[PDB]
Symmetry: D2
Subunit: 229 residues, 4 copies
C-alpha cells in the first residue's frame, strides 16, 4: 500500500501517544517515517519506540512548532536528509488565565497556528502534492473549544489554499482513550465502546494515502460515532 | 485487503453509474459482490458489466426499494444464495413529488438497512452515496436518516455513513467506509468533491 | 408595532398550544389575527380562546394541511373574507414506510403547501414562520423541514417573502427533561409559549427585515451544549 | 419599547459604521446609549453623530479592546458614570504567526474580555451582541466564542448572540443582488433592527445564536 511513501509524524511523546498509534499503522503498511518531538527529554523515548518498528533507520528531529525558526530549520533538514515527503501527520493538544488573553492566544498559537506554519513549510517538500492531517485530542468557559473551532476552520482554509498545490488537508477528531468520560462514551457512543490509537492510525492511513484522493478540508470523527448524538 | 468480504451494491444502471465505479474498486480489492437493479431492462446491462470484473460468478437481484416486498425477498434470496454479507452500498410543487422524493431518497435507506441488518449478525458497514430543490429537502432527510440509523444500529455493530459526491474516487472512499479501515466512524458524511 | 397587520395563525388546539402563546403576543401588539384548526372538535375551543384576546371579530378556518384541497379553499376564503395578509405562523431501524412518509408529509410538506398558498395573499411580500417543538423518525422529519425552510426562503426571496423557523424547547418523560434542560442549558430556566410568540413576532414583523432562511432556537440556548 | 434601557455601543467610526446604524435604531426606540471609540481622532466624529440622535447627553469613552487595561478602566468609568447597563453591542471589523494571532485577538478575544467586563454592570442579566483567508478563521473562532460565552454566562442571565451581516457599500456586490434570494442588498438599519431584537427582551429565550442579516444569502 504505502511502500516508498515517506511521512512526517509529529507529536509522539510516549507509546500511548495517539501519534504513535498512527505510526505503528503506517509502519505496518511499509511507509518510511520521520518523527518530531518537542522536549529534548523525549528524544531517547522516541529512539526506544522506533525500535518497536521496522524502521530501516532513525530520523528524529526536534521541533517546537511554537517557534518559526525551529519549524523552518526542521523541515529543511528533513528535506536535506530525506528528500521530498508524501505527507505530514500533526498531532497536538495542550491545555496548560481562565479567561486570560495569554491563555486564549497561546491556545490558538498551539492548537490552530501550528498547523498553518507546518503546512507552509511542509509544502516545500511536496512539489507534486501530498496530504496533511491534523489530529485533535472542561470548565466555566472552554477556551480549548474555541481553539478547536479555530483549528477546524484553519483546516478548511488551508485545504482550500493548498488545493491548487495538490495538497490535501484534513482533520481527525478523536474521541477518548486509555475514567468518568469513559463512563460517558461507552455509555452513549453509538458503537457502544471506546476508540483508540490504532483506529485513528487507520483513518490517518486512509487520509495520508491516495485512498482519500478526493477528500480535502474534511474532518473525520474517529469516536465510535459519538459526534452524531 | 477485501478478499473474503461480501458486499451488496445497489444502483448500477450503466457503466457511468457511480455505483459502478464503487464496484470496480471493490472488485479490484478482491471482494465478492452482489448486485441489485430496478428495471428488468437493466439486468442485461449489469450482466454485461460484470464481464469487466473478475467476479467468479454473477449474483444479480432485481429490487425496487420503492416497495417493501421486493426488498424483503431480495435480501432473503441474497441471504439464502450467498449467506451473510459484510455491508451494503446504497446509491440512488406537489405533495406527491415531495413524498416520492422522500420515499426513494431517504426511506429506501431505512428499509434496506433494516433488511440487510439480518445478514450481518456480527456487524458491517452501510454506505449511502448522494426552482425550489425538493431534491435538497430529500438529501437533508437522507443525511439525517444516516445519523439516526448509524445511531440505531451502533449497538448491532453496524456503521452507517454517507458519501456526498469521479466514480473511482468515490469507490475508493467507499472502499474505506465499507472496510475495516473506517472502524470508528459511524454517522459520518464524507465529501468526495475535491472539497 | 403591528396595528393593521394581519396574520394567519395555525395549530392552536388548547390554551397550552405554543401557537396560542404566539397569538397572545401578536394580539397584544395590535395585529388582526386569523386562525386555523384541524379538528371540528377544536373549533369551539378556539372561539373560547379568542375571547381572552381583543379580537374585533372571529375568523376561524378549518384546515387539514394534510390535504391540498382544504388548504387551497382555506386560503381562498381567508383571501375573500379578510383580503391580503402580512404573514403566516405554521405550528405543527424499524419505522414503516408509511410512518416515515407521514412524518414528512405533516412536518415538512405542510409548510411547502401552506407557503405556496399563502403566497397568493402577499403580493407585496410578507413573513412565514414554522415552529418546531421537541430510532426517531421525528428527527428526520425536522431535518426535512429545516431544509424546506431554507429552500422556500430561497424560492420566495424574489416574491419578497421571508421564510424562517423557530426551534423550541420543552414545556408540555417530560417531568425528567424539564429538569434536564434546567441544569445543563445555559440560562438555567425553561422556555415557554410567550418567549416563542415574542421571537415569532420579531420574525413576522418588519423587525426581521433582512432575515430569511434562518432558524432560531428559543430554548434558553440549549442548542449550544 | 426601550425607554430606560441603557446600552453600550462599540465600534462607531463614521456615519457609515454598521454600529452607527444599530445606534440610530436604539435611539429611535428610546434607549440611552453609551459609546466607545478607539482612536482619539474619532472622538470628535462621534460627538458630531450624537447630534443626529436624541441623546440627552453624550457619554463617550475611549477604549482599545486590544488592551485589558483600557477595557477594564473604561467599563468601570461607564459603571461609575452611568450605573448599570442592559446590554452591549460589540461591532469589530478588519500568512504570519502575528497576523493569525492579531486577527484572533481582535476578532474573537475582544468579545471574551468585553463580556467579562460588561458582566459586572449587569447584575440582573442583559444581552451581548457581537456583529461580524485568516479572517475566516478569526470569525470561526468568534462564532465559537459566542457559543461558549453564551454558555458560560447563561447562569448569570446574560445572553450572547451574534449577527452575521452581508456587505454594505460594485463587483462582489453584483454577485449578491444577483444570487441572494431577498434580491437586493443589506444595510446598517437592517442590522440595527435585529440588533434591537437581540438586545431587547424580545429575544428572551435566545442565547448563543448567530443571525444572518444578509438577505438570506447564507442559505445559498
Amino acid at each position: 500500500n504505502l511502500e516508498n511513501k515517506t511521512y512526517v509524524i509529529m507529536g509522539i511523546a510516549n507509546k500511548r501517544s495517539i501519534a504513535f498509534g498512527v505510526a505503528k499503522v503506517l509502519d505496518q503498511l511499509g511507509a518510511k517515517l520521520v518523527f518530531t518531538y518537542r522536549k529534548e527529554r523525549s528524544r531517547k523515548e522516541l529512539e526506544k519506540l522506533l525500535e518497536q518498528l521496522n524502521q530501516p533507520e532513525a530520523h528524529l528531529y526536534q521541533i517546537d512548532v511554537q517557534s518559526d525558526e525551529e519549524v523552518i530549520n526542521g523541515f529543511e533538514q528533513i528535506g536535506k536528509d530525506v528528500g521530498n515527503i508524501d505527507g505530514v501527520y500533526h498531532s497536538i493538544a495542550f491545555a496548560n488565565s481562565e479567561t486570560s488573553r495569554e491563555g486564549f492566544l497561546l491556545a490558538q498559537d498551539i492548537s490552530s497556528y501550528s498547523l498553518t506554519i507546518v503546512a507552509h513549510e511542509a509544502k516545500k517538500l511536496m512539489p507534486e502534492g501530498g496530504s496533511i492531517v491534523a489530529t485533535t485530542y472542561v470548565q466555566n468557559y472552554n477556551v480549548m473549544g474555541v481553539a478547536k473551532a479555530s483549528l477546524e476552520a484553519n483546516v478548511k482554509y488551508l485545504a482550500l489554499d493548498l488545493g491548487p498545490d495538490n495538497i490535501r488537508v484534513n482533520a481527525i477528531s478523536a474521541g477518548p482513550i486509555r475514567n468518568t468520560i469513559l463512563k460517558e462514551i461507552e455509555e452513549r457512543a453509538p458503537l457502544k465502546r471506546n476508540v483508540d490509537q490504532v483506529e485513528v492510525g487507520k483513518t490517518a492511513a486512509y487520509l495520508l494515502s491516495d485512498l482519500s484522493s478526493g477528500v480535502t478540508g474534511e474532518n473525520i470523527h474517529v469516536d465510535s460515532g459519538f459526534h452524531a448524538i
